[PDB]
Structure formats: structure tokens, C-alpha cells
Design a protein around this ligand. Sequence first.
Ligand code: VV5
Lengths: 237, 300
Amino acid sequence: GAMNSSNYAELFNNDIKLFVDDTNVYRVTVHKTFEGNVATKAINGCIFTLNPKTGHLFLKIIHTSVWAGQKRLSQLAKWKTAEEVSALVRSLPKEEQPKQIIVTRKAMLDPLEVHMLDFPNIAIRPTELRLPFSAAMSIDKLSDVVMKATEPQMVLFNIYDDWLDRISSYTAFSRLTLLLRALKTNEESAKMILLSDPTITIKSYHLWPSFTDEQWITIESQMRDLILTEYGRKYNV
Amino acid sequence: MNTVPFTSAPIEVTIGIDQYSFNVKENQPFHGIKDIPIGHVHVIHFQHADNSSMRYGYWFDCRMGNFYIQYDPKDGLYKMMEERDGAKFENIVHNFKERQMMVSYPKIDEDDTWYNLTEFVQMDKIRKIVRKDENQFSYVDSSMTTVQENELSDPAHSLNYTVINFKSREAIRPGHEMEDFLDKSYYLNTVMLQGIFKNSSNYFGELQFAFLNAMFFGNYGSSLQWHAMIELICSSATVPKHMLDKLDEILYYQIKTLPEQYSDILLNERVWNICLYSSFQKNSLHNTEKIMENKYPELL
Ligand SMILES: O=C(NCCc1cccs1)c1cccnc1
């Protein structure tokens, strides 16, 4: 059934699972036409598919050409996502295929269920968590590869960098979700917090700065402050 | 006109013949039902006074033999049976008519209700859904489950309706996932109509049989089947025109006949709102939509 706060530790057991988020697949800018009407211009997207135990981010870039001449693009987008997840599973050796795929929006269940009829033993599940994966386009390197793509293209990163060498999946997922939630709530302040100190660098294959343990604690504390504050500024408290 | 005599009425029972019904008191002198119109299927059903649980009855066609009802005190139900001795049967029926111990099938001459609710229902097809080939009549009751319900437990006593499942490999062509799921014309026209049912009369015949079993016996799985077969049509962008015009009539009469107080359990809010207001065929069921909105505007 649905994934919620009560069965949260299942994410970190040894059953392979993926999270799939489709928020950023179909993206537009809205602008005025010469005649004073409004039109959209699509920009590149991505499917955010993530193994929460290993940190593997299978990032599938969606190039604007995929929409050309199509109607009902918000609905097509959900199916286009399901088609790509399905192709990804089929590309993986059997022992690497997920036993469960958890979709972050309920509108994805039927498109993915239908694309995965070939895989009756893969459970397709929703969640009651309000996960901040839509903020993934606030991660500079992810946004850069998405925006520069001139064709469809799959890119790979470990969203946990090398963290698992020192911390558990559980803690690594909790850090990731705190960083994303902060980037979603106040992007500028979140980024200032991460990059203020020029001496902490981001390695070439990594997405986040190379913080020591003590520095991650400071950072984590500063993101929690941010999220509590903006929640006052937003609700005046 | 034909006759279904009864040996006796040993227990108090509400007897139904098609859309009509009447109360028989324990050991009342009742010897059966006369003037049954030839040329249609019929259903004679029972609800005991002591146990409103278990409605049951018998689908039959008087052209396929001489049938009678006889209470069985071991199994405790009114059983349909066939008499093969045609002379014995006529003699018995004549005796009972002379003494006037039979109720008359009470058809009004303006009334085509039963015809319109059974137009495509044929005994030979009923017998394939209700597997019991040693009898020319078919027993149904409230508790019998469907072949798809047993997939989701006794196979001999099930209803073998045609399995319809919108999220199945049969319904969905590789490479047309979104196309085939949002627009079920492939599945209706090629898989089901050309492939399984062969024509729209047989399709409509299962649909009508499913509806009647739902109404008369409160059979939950028949109710599911009836809604399924409606939804498949309504969710197909491409449907022969004659089938839509007939579907509208079919449903019109089913809605007209449904007991007003049973609407809450026999009608699925989601299916009907989808069919009447969101589906490809939302503008195609003028008679059905008009009676639905005037009789059950609550459901919508
Ligand atoms: O391919 C990489 N890691 C192998 C495991 C993965 C599978 C799927 C995604 S990662 C990789 C690439 C770039 C940065 N760190 C690691």
C-alpha cells in the first residue's frame, strides 16, 4: 500500500526499490505574445528516479523535442515518465531490477502500472510523505546537464556523494531530504549556506561540498533554522 | 402460453416470476404459474419468509422442455425439475387449471418491459455462463461468485462471465499503453467483440443477464460485470452507431425497472458519472441520461 511515516524504515532494507518523481518532466515558461495573448514555451526536463539505499540517481533528461506536435502535454508527461521508467527496468539485469517502485504523485500509479504489466512481481506504490524531490533542479550540476542537453540523454550521479562511507542510508536520506526541503523553501538562503565558505569545495563527480563531519552538523543545523524561520515568515509566528 | 406447475408450497415464500412477485403462505393451496409468454427466457425466483438470506431461482425457456417446481425437504429449497413424460405433464397441468390453483403471468398488453430487458439474452448462452449441462434450466443465487472473483472458490458453482480487466495485457497493446488505456476501442472492438463475443448481440446478452442477476438476486459479481461492460463501451472513442443507440435503450429500461430503494447498492456512482459526463460517449446516451437525472439525481 502507501508509504508513510509508520513504515519509513523499509526504504533502507535490502529489497531493491526506486523512488520516481515526475514534477520536473514537463516544464514551461509562460510569456505574452505579440498580440497580447499568453503562450507557453517548454524547456528541458528530467525524470528523477532514485535508489534511497544506494544513492543512485538515474537522471533521464527530457528534451523539448519530445512534445513537438503533441496535445495534452501534462497528461502525456505522466505516460512519458512511465515509459521511460519501464525502459530503465528492462535495461537492468534481473537481479538489479527493483521489487518496488514508489511514485511521488498518485497520478503516476496508473501510467506506470500499465507500462509495467510485463512485471507483475514489481509492486507500484504511492506515498503519503511530502518529499521535496522537485527541488532537484536547484542542484547546480543537475540543472546544468538538463539545460545544456540537445537530445534525450540519461546521466548518472550518486546523490549521496561519498557519504555512505561514513553514515548510514537512513542518515544519508535524511540529510538529502533536509537539503532539498531547504532549497525548496528558500533557494537563495539554502545555497548561501552551502557555498558561503569558499574553502569547502565540490569534487568533480560529487554534487555537494566536501564537508567534514563537524561541518555537516553545522550545515544541517543551519538548514533546520532556515526551514523553521521561513515557516514563520510564511505563517507570521 | 406455457405453464410451470408446482407439486406443492410447503413453506412460506415470496415467489418471483420475471419482474412480478407474490406471497405464498405455508401449505397454501398453490399449484403453479400459467400463461407464461412463449418466446422469451424467464426467471422464477424465491425468497423464503424465514430467511431473506439467499435469494435463488432458475433461468429457463419453456420451448426447451416441460418444467415444474417441487420443494425438497432435505436440501430445503424449491427445486426446478424437468418432466420427460409429456403426457403425464399435460394431464397434471390440466387437472390444476380446471381447479384454478395457478396464478396467471400478469402481462399488460401495452407492456414490452420484459422483452426490452431480455432482448439479447439466449438460454444457450446462459448455460455457458452457469455450467451445469445435465439440466436445461440454470440455477443462480445471491452468493455465487464469478470466475474473476475466484481469481481475486468452488469452480462448479460459479458464474463464468467474460473476464474484462482494463489493466491487463489483453486490454493493452505493447507500444500503445497510453493510447489503449485512455481509449479502449481496441479492447472493445477487436479483442472482445470480434474476438470473444463475435457480435454485439452476444455482448449485449451477457450485459443484460448480468444486470438481471444483480437485481433479482443481489449478486454482487454480476453487478460488477454489468458496470464493467457499460464502462468498456463508454470509454471507447470508436463504437458502431447502432450499438450506442441500442445501449441507450437497454440501459434506459434497466434504470426504469430498478427498485428505487435499491439504487444505492446496485448503481456505482463512479461508473455512471464517468459514463454520462466524462466519457467519449457522454453525449450519446440521451434516453439513459434523462431518466438517470430525473430519478436518481442524488447519485450524480
Ligand atoms: O555511475 C556512478 N556510480 C555507479 C552506480 C550508479 C548507478 C546509477 C547511478 S550511480 C557514478 C557516476 C557519477 C558519480 N558517482 C558515481
